[PDB]
Design a protein around this ligand. Structure first.
Ligand SMILES: [Ca+2]
Ligand SMILES: [Ca+2]
Lengths: 323, 323
């Protein structure tokens, strides 16, 4: 039995764990100051809480334009022998005329073997351009049929809400080849609480299927995870092939004080078999000051199972450990 | 043999642990953004790495004056049945004409039993005023012969360096009764590398003596700890009664990559007997960008012993654990 003492990582939001071929787990997440991208590594999940970080990229100076504010949800990918980090950044901390954030998507690249050796090894690839000149963030990527796919969240001015999930095939790891295809938009009760939101896409491949988990509603007690699925022998670029579950697959446990589990990612336990769900959560509701600067979204790690139909079973957020 | 897997806390500088009579260890430190005072609690030292913080006080908005920037080195004290936190804060992030920070010393108070219940229980006591209108920070307090003493670091324009150590008897936990008495000024080789500094005072009482540890030199690999001591039956307000050791009592271990240990505090292990040294350290020297915003000072916790003369023996920084 695999069970970690949670929260594994204190004060880290949008957690992303990547188990590399060198035996290390690489941890990357949004830091509370949103001012840089850092990596930590350990051979165990528990080791991550005592793993000393290295900054791989610092935000540009305030007032200098793009990539100068709110460095959000970085993910570390190892694609065709090279390291890439997908992240969102804004030119400003201010809300626009519609009370929305102004992020665009970016990428950094590292050709060196050790992604933690030095930040001088990391180079900017610039903005990931889409069809729309609008709010975009939480990009991830996945491989299928020797093709590379980019999955992200983006605002459509013509669709109600903050963001919808899109897919596109990639020309290279920082450029789209095909036009964005909308896979999901906020529409059900569970994803439209306070704000209409679809974000934090995470990809999981198993049992001849492709699973796409995401987070819906506002970042408070209402924040929950949803899921889309497709048979892996179908065209992933045809939205009609993807099925959206009309209910959350993971949500708050009010009784156990686990508020708004979300912005999930996946990894595998030290046994190399047990599947792990990685997500952030809050332990209180009484946020004071600007909630953006309340740093207490903590990283949780817990195993998940599979049903007889070959679908993941996430269950409930694991209760916290008090030592 | 008491041993913790180090670093105990990632990205926490100026670490301070207070073991309360309810069994809890309360942890308070400088957060990398220097924007608030938070507390966390656990029944074990290792447990603090997974303890969920609560914010007890937030900095004032930028541009509003005192307490609006760079919230540094908070310490939690339980004095006469009430909670107090000593911290330094500036009206600006800017260096003055002499390239120095512009901090003053402050205090917040909480009369409620639970110091973590709500920030609404915490009240500002304002600036702790001294003789000199100058740079002051790192205040601590201690009790002796039923009197309360304030120990802090402060700049004298007429003495070479950034700060000296001072003592004064307190009228109440946020106001001085006697005039400040300088106990130490930077003068030795080990405390004058790059900058002439005396800061981070910490009090330890044992074997009929009062030990005053402090940190000297610039915050790079030259950062080291020094010690003053007094026979506890002597007047603590008379500088001539204090002995200053001419050498460091704790310093960097370049070979094991433990750079610039300092800004220490003390606690006792879960056995209620073993004395623990608590300090921050760096694991690299190649800091990029502004070093003030490099967040990688990590909290270390390790036991110390005593010699046959009744002096503490701090040894060397404990090598890191990699899991
Ligand atoms: Ca993500
Ligand atoms: Ca202190």
């Amino acid at each position: 039995t695999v069970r970690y003492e949670n929260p594994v990582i204190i004060q880290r939001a949008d957690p992303y764990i990547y188990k590399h071929t060198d035996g290390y787990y690489y941890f990357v997440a949004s830091v509370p100051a949103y001012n840089l991208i850092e990596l930590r590594r350990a051979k165990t999940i528990d080791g991550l809480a005592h793993a000393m970080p290295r900054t791989i990229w610092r935000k540009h100076d305030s007032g200098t334009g793009a990539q100068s504010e709110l460095i959000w949800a970085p993910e570390l990918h190892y694609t065709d022998g090279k390291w890439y980090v997908y992240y969102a950044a804004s030119h400003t901390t201010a809300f626009d005329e519609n009370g929305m954030f102004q992020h665009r998507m970016f990428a950094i690249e590292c050709d060196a073997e050790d992604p933690m050796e030095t930040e001088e090894n990391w180079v900017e690839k610039g903005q990931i351009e889409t069809h729309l000149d609008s709010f975009a963030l939480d990009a991830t990527s996945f491989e299928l049929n020797d093709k590379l796919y980019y999955v992200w969240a983006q605002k459509d001015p013509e669709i109600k809400g903050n963001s919808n999930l899109y897919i596109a095939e990639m020309e290279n790891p920082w450029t789209l080849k095909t036009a964005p295809v909308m896979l999901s938009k906020p529409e059900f009760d569970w994803e439209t609480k306070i704000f209409w939101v679809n974000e934090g896409p995470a990809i999981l491949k198993r049992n001849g299927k492709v699973f796409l988990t995401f987070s819906g509603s506002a970042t408070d007690e209402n924040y929950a995870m949803g899921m889309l699925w497709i048979e892996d022998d179908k065209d992933v670029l045809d939205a009609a092939n993807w099925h959206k579950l009309d209910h959350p697959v993971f949500q708050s446990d009010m009784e156990n004080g686990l508020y708004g589990p979300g912005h999930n990612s996946f990894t595998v336990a030290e046994d190399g078999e047990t599947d792990l769900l990685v997500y952030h959560v809050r332990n209180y509701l009484d946020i004071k000051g600007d909630p953006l600067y309340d740093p207490n979204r903590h990283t949780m790690v817990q195993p998940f199972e599979w049903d007889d139909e070959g679908f993941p079973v996430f269950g409930k957020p694991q209760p916290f450990t008090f030592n």
